[PDB]
Amino acid sequence: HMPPNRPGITFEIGARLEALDYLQKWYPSRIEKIDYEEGKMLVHFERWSHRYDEWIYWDSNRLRPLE
């Protein structure tokens, strides 16, 4: 499947955005992996261990542009 177009975000590996972790805190983040079958992405919250990476659907409002 193809990712949606959303302003301020590019859905590609290594692209940067802001992402809401499961504690509802925003962090500058990086797209690590994209699952194009499910439409979800592995998001890495910067300066956190990769054990805290989270899978977020690419149309989620847990993702927003990084200014």
Binding site: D21, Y22, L23, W48, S49, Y52
Partner: peptide
């Protein structure tokens, strides 16, 4: 830095 407490 961790994300849970107990």
């Amino acid at each position: 830095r961790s994300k849970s407490d107990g």
